[PDB]
Amino acid sequence: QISVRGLAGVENVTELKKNFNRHLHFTLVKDRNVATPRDYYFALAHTVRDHLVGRWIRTQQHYYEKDPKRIYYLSLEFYMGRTLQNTMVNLALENACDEATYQLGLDMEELEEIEEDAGLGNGGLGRLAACFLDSMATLGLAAYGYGIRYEFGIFNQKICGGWQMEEADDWLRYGNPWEKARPEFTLPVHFYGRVEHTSQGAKWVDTQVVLAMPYDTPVPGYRNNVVNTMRLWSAKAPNDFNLGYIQAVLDRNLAENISRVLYPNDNFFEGKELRLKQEYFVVAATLQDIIRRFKSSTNFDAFPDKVAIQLNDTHPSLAIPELMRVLVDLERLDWDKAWEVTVKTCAYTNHTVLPEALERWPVHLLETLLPRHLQIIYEINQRFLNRVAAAFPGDVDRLRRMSLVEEGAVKRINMAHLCIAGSHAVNGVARIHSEILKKTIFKDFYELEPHKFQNKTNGITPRRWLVLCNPGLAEIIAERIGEEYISDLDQLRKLLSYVDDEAFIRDVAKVKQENKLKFAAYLEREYKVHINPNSLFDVQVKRIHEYKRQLLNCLHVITLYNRIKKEPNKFVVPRTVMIGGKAAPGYHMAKMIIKLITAIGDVVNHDPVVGDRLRVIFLENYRVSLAEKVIPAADLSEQISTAGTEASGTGNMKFMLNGALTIGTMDGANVEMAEEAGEENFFIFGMRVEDVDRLDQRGYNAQEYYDRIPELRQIIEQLSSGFFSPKQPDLFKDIVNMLMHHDRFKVFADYEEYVKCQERVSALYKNPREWTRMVIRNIATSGKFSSDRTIAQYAREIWGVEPSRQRLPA
Amino acid sequence: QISVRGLAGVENVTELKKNFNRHLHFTLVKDRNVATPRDYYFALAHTVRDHLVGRWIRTQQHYYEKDPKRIYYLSLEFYMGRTLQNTMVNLALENACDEATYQLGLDMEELEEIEEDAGLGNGGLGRLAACFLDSMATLGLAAYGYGIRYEFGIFNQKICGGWQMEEADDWLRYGNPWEKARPEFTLPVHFYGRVEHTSQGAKWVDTQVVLAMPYDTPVPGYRNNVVNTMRLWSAKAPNDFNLGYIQAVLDRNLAENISRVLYPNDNFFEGKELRLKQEYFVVAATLQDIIRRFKSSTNFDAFPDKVAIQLNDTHPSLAIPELMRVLVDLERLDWDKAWEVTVKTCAYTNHTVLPEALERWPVHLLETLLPRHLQIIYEINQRFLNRVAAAFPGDVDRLRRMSLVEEGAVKRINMAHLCIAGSHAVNGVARIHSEILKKTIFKDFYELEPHKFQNKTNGITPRRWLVLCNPGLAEIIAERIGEEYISDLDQLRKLLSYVDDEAFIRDVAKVKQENKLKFAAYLEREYKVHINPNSLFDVQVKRIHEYKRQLLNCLHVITLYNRIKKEPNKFVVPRTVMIGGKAAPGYHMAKMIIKLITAIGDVVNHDPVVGDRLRVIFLENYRVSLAEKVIPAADLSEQISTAGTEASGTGNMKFMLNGALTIGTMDGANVEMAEEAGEENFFIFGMRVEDVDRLDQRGYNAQEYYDRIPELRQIIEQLSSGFFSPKQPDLFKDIVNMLMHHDRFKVFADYEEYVKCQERVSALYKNPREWTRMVIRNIATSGKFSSDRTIAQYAREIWGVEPSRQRLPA
Numbered sequence A, B: 001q002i003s004v005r006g007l008a009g010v011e012n013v014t015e016l017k018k019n020f021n022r023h024l025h026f027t028l029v030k031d032r033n034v035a036t037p038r039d040y041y042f043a044l045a046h047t048v049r050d051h052l053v054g055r056w057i058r059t060q061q062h063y064y065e066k067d068p069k070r071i072y073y074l075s076l077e078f079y080m081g082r083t084l085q086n087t088m089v090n091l092a093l094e095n096a097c098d099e100a101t102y103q104l105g106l107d108m109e110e111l112e113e114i115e116e117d118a119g120l121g122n123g124g125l126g127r128l129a130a131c132f133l134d135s136m137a138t139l140g141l142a143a144y145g146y147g148i149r150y151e152f153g154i155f156n157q158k159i160c161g162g163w164q165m166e167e168a169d170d171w172l173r174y175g176n177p178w179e180k181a182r183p184e185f186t187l188p189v190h191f192y193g194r195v196e197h198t199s200q201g202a203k204w205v206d207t208q209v210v211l212a213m214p215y216d217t218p219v220p221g222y223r224n225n226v227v228n229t230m231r232l233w234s235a236k237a238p239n240d241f242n243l244g245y246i247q248a249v250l251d252r253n254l255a256e257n258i259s260r261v262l263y264p265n266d267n268f269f270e271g272k273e274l275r276l277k278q279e280y281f282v283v284a285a286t287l288q289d290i291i292r293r294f295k296s297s298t299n300f301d302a303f304p305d306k307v308a309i310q311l312n313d314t315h316p317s318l319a320i321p322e323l324m325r326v327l328v329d330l331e332r333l334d335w336d337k338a339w340e341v342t343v344k345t346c347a348y349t350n351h352t353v354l355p356e357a358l359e360r361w362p363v364h365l366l367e368t369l370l371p372r373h374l375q376i377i378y379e380i381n382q383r384f385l386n387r388v389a390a391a392f393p394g395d396v397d398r399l400r401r402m403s404l405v406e407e408g409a410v411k412r413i414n415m416a417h418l419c420i421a422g423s424h425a426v427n428g429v430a431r432i433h434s435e436i437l438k439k440t441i442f443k444d445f446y447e448l449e450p451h452k453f454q455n456k457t458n459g460i461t462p463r464r465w466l467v468l469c470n471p472g473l474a475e476i477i478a479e480r481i482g483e484e485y486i487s488d489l490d491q492l493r494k495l496l497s498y499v500d501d502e503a504f505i506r507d508v509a510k511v512k513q514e515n516k517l518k519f520a521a522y523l524e525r526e527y528k529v530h531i532n533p534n535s536l537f538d539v540q541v542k543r544i545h546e547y548k549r550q551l552l553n554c555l556h557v558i559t560l561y562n563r564i565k566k567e568p569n570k571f572v573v574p575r576t577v578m579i580g581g582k583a584a585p586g587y588h589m590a591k592m593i594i595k596l597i598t599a600i601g602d603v604v605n606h607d608p609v610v611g612d613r614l615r616v617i618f619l620e621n622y623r624v625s626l627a628e629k630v631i632p633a634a635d636l637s638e639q640i641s642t643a644g645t646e647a648s649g650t651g652n653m654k655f656m657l658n659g660a661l662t663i664g665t666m667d668g669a670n671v672e673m674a675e676e677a678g679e680e681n682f683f684i685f686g687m688r689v690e691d692v693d694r695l696d697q698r699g700y701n702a703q704e705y706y707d708r709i710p711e712l713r714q715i716i717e718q719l720s721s722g723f724f725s726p727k728q729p730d731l732f733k734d735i736v737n738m739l740m741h742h743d744r745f746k747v748f749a750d751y752e753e754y755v756k757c758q759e760r761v762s763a764l765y766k767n768p769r770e771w772t773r774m775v776i777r778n779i780a781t782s783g784k785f786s787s788d789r790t791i792a793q794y795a796r797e798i799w800g801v802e803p804s805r806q807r808l809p810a
């Protein structure tokens, strides 16, 4: 059908058809008279996965022979989404399978909708890990993703009476065709116990043992025949566990609860024991696996030449004292050599600046659970602080500021401080975030070791986030500039010479229109909701957090509503305002914001005077599969965090690549995005970081804004008095009180500029030719935000390895 | 190699070889350089199972088209053992796979040792269910086994310092190639709640829901291309279960614990709530599945013409009030018609007479867990007792004796009484057991409804228990009489005309010798134990129970030891005495008996004066796979339960078929076995049932025996004084006290006759030609004890369906 989806050869199509029927019969034990759509999906899935195995076996064989330096990417989250289409795309099988299934009398797109998301992450950090794995395979690096196989991923979100309900994401219910259990490689992980000191050093004894069972999932590169591995650990009780009889067997559950569920509280650090166990479990199992592989290459001096470990935030920070423990206690290296090896091996990526998100584990927890690790941490702290003392003699306050141990009511370990001390590199995830690290939160560490601090601006994979989710746009671009850009996204610059091309303009706008019709249909079909596809699609999708300022968007929405009611017979650009995202189950304010959004929808969507000039829809259960649908259909991307709070953002980049214009603050990656496209091609508004700092100095007084902006006052009055909650008039009192008296994120301060800027957006949209021309200049300059570029920078500047675009033999 | 194992055709062998390699690559994701023996087993397993699927799909298709009457065999236990060899045997693939694996450079027998036992049963009742499924498929009946998929089966037994230790049987750890999950057919099961009465009848409301997920396993007939289904239910939490957040997800475990583990307490009824839940779970899910299938045939008058439900003991007795509940409350049939349908549908098999084993559920349990079922049971009881009153007017004691409700401290439901009331047939499992039911324990019910009471003497499958475990014996028989006997075991009578055939005599004795060498080797290899293979193999294998009198065997063993020590230079027939079996974890006396056996071994096996004339070995972890090894190697089968206590026994029959002579009491099936072979060809001793009754009348005084038998006194003195426990002299005080003052099973009363009879055994064994001739007359008359015969009797006399030896088209 379309070019970039590969060849549908006669030989291939005939082969796919017969293997499909083979799987239906032998694998699924069905025949065509009993088979459901789900059976058909599984048959296709097995037919496709057959094509990975030879490539997977010989890639891993290749790494054994050539013995390159290995990259280990440690994360507690991998937000993978669906795998079928991604695999077809990366193997050039998409048109062939489409044809084969067509001739079998099936619609492949319908089968694709049956696959569950692998929802093993919360948001940006988890999705970043998934994009990175894809780029690492595409760039031919010998890379492994290591994490936990959660039985339950991020909860499915139901909206009930306007309110979020959570339900278990039982994603493994029907089986996972993309994993291979490897029970033969099961490893023991130890907990509790005590430390004994002997003549021959320390020994960790009387431990409880939990088994770590690995499951491998393939990660195919883009048409280079490379298939890397993601290894996820599952928790298993040992067989003499608790071993009246019946109870002992039932208590095996306690051990296995370690990998049962993903923590969804991305807002607020909770020092929960189960979470600590999860963090140690992935680290202990992974490091044994690493050392095993290394020993199959006594000389640990070569360890850093052969191993790189990337720590995705502080969640796997225990890798540092765990590597030390192994090297010192088990291999009997001396401390200094062990430390040298550890530092050269580990690197740390920070993904936030919000204080309440930082991991600070109570000492009494580490004492009971990991007694030997606390001792190692204490020793690291002493030696580190001795280095600080010698560099800044007499600076006693620096010492307490830099300590890994925080004193107070409860003593705590600062895991970020541990990571910086024990890593040769520390990076932020966009240029302004990295500068903020060096200037404010890790200033003392930067002064001590400026060489450690780097930037690696985030990216997204153009395979999933263009080719897969927006084939129409991929095709019209391919027609003009060829297919090479898919794995060299900088080529999109060549599109600049088409900004005045009437045909291209028409094609870009047509692709968008089709995307909007497709999504407007999806809404009616799966959610019985009626939207006008000629309106501007105004979309904000991301986790619900105060810093992300979904509330500022709410304020604009009500402003538009009030202006319509005021001058009903005046013309305004019609909008469909879509907001979506999950709230952490314990985050009251975020749950209230969701309720507000639905409450507004309830008023706005049923007002006859509004007609269909304004619609407000809450997008339920936002997740990778839904992002792949809504992003290609968007016209306006809302990226409106208070400057200084969004470390990078990556959703922003997905919208840019897919032909939406951006309204945003100079925050995170938005800055670099505006820089690449030109500030004239971006709707920038609001305080910069410096203005925020100024405001904090004087003190932020929300009342000032309320007193001087009558349009804002009106909104606040409506909220208080119960205009949006007729039956519970004080329903939103918490929200109003927060905005008026304790708003950490200065919602009111940006209100005027935001509304003004929104007027400029509406103006441009009235001129379709000029809207589309600006869109073209965005797409054309989105090349920098490919994760191939990000990963090539990690490889060269942190891990010390050269990427390669060369094919392995098929 | 050997005939009965089928053809190894050039085309077949080449096909098996390539499918093996296909599976190794695509299914296991290995290549020959990394593959372990386990990988090889799995590749063969997948290669073999491929041959079942077409047969499985068309058998079930056939039953849909022809719509025969369906047999549902309900059991909480299916002791299946291993499946690979059984499948090859039933499909005629054994020689072909042996060849194919040979040419691949593998030993198939070694691969077969890798498969775990499906240990989903305790002993005889569970193994009976497995033999029955095999015969039902072999006889072409449209039959389904329904049960629970336990995550953990019967525990593995470790012997530590002479003592039993239990460890979890994690049989699913590496995956089960013989099952197919069917999540699409998941059904809800309800618990707790309350009953509401409306105008439109009773309604069961406010229930907790647990999901039942079926797993199907094939059951192939012997070379007839029939493949029936065993469906096992697994417990799953519903997705809004408990739905702070983290805990809610972790508590899903509570629902799923229902199918976690098999109860191993075969000795003593424990009214544990979890066990009741298991019993209801299998019943509720199964009956919905049955009704579903029936409705795909309002007219429930045809229900008994289309459905038979066999209840394996009282464990699924809740099927009776559950069928009533559905028919009355949900389909709105009137009580009398519902009852008529239920009775004609259900039949009950009793597997014991021991009072402490009978299920008597406290009313307060059924009240909380199954409030509607208690009401239904009460109503059944009233109507039943009204029938009793009318038949035996004024007999008030009969009324209280026959009631389903037992009064007392705690009111209880007698589940056996429920089963008899609600079934059209009640059978025992051997002729003497069935007579005992009618004369003693169910006398009142027999007087009321004599037509209900039947006998169906147990059997074993000659596929597993001859062809599979003893190919050498199967072959030498096949040479003389052909292969037809394998599915028509009565043909073995033809062997009588060979009792004086010198060649046959020589061949029978040679097969036994090879079996003993093979087992003597297995012992040395896997357990570093040294046995003389020229000795008489004296074997008692079965669960450890007082009624089974492993203690009487212990007494004989010590007698032989004492007689040797007394006259060291006298000749005696050398013996290897092997005893094995698991004890229920809470059964103290049974655990003490195991300790005694090992303790004796410790003394006897290290006495230089004994040499190798006497060895005592405890066979660890007795289970189906071990039975398949030890039974063909046995010379003497010990079947020595107190007369009246072993309902049938089936191990007895396995030994008979495999060329061991039997020493036994006239108990259970032993009677019919002696009757078939001739009492001259059997070593019968001890009290008959009548003698036991007499002894109880006068009162059993153990002291009498102790006073009159000096050889017995000596043994008791040795036990008391600590001869077998030098470091803990009073270790066996419990055992001695039990024997002297509270022996329910009259061990001493049979002592003299037993020892005497054992002398007669030793005498015969000195004359090999005559030993073997008697062996031939046993094998030749073991035809009656085939489960094909047993099942043909159930089919004709209970279920009303005709068996068929006709092939389905391949």
Ligand SMILES: OC[C@H]1O[C@@H](NC(=S)N/N=C/c2ccc(C(F)(F)F)cc2)[C@H](O)[C@@H](O)[C@@H]1O
Residues within 6 Å of the ligand: A049, A050, A052, A053, A056, A174, A175, A176, A177, A178, A179, A180, A181, A182, A217, A218, B026, B027, B028, B029, B175
């Ligand atoms: O879902 C049912 C079960 O299947 C099992 N898979 C087995 S037996 N073969 N896999 C083969 C395989 C082939 C190719 C690939 C891929 F995609 F190319 F990489 C992955 C796996 C899984 O181990 C188990 O966890 C799972 O629950």
Ligand SMILES: OC[C@H]1O[C@@H](NC(=S)N/N=C/c2ccc(C(F)(F)F)cc2)[C@H](O)[C@@H](O)[C@@H]1O
Residues within 6 Å of the ligand: A122, A123, A124, A125, A126, A128, A262, A263, A264, A265, A266, A267, A275, A351, A352, A357, A429, A458, A646, A647, A648, A649, A650, A668
């Ligand atoms: O760099 C990629 C993206 O990273 C994001 N950081 C995220 S998602 N941190 N998650 C923290 C977290 C903490 C605890 C937990 C929990 F619950 F304990 F399991 C889960 C997540 C940035 O906010 C974004 O600007 C950036 O683009």
Ligand SMILES: OC[C@H]1O[C@@H](NC(=S)N/N=C/c2ccc(C(F)(F)F)cc2)[C@H](O)[C@@H](O)[C@@H]1O
Residues within 6 Å of the ligand: A026, A027, A028, A029, A175, B049, B050, B052, B053, B056, B174, B175, B176, B177, B178, B179, B180, B181, B182, B217, B218
């Ligand atoms: O062990 C890995 C997993 O495999 C799954 N099997 C799947 S996907 N195909 N089965 C095909 C099949 C073919 C033939 C037969 C047989 F023997 F002819 F009857 C049985 C099953 C199981 O459903 C799951 O419970 C299990 O854990």
Ligand SMILES: OC[C@H]1O[C@@H](NC(=S)N/N=C/c2ccc(C(F)(F)F)cc2)[C@H](O)[C@@H](O)[C@@H]1O
Residues within 6 Å of the ligand: B122, B123, B124, B125, B126, B128, B262, B263, B264, B265, B266, B267, B275, B351, B352, B357, B429, B458, B646, B647, B648, B649, B650, B668
């Ligand atoms: O007919 C076949 C054989 O059946 C046997 N009966 C057995 S095994 N009953 N099990 C009872 C039992 C009770 C409770 C439990 C438990 F633990 F709650 F789960 C398990 C088993 C007879 O004793 C034998 O003579 C006969 O040959």
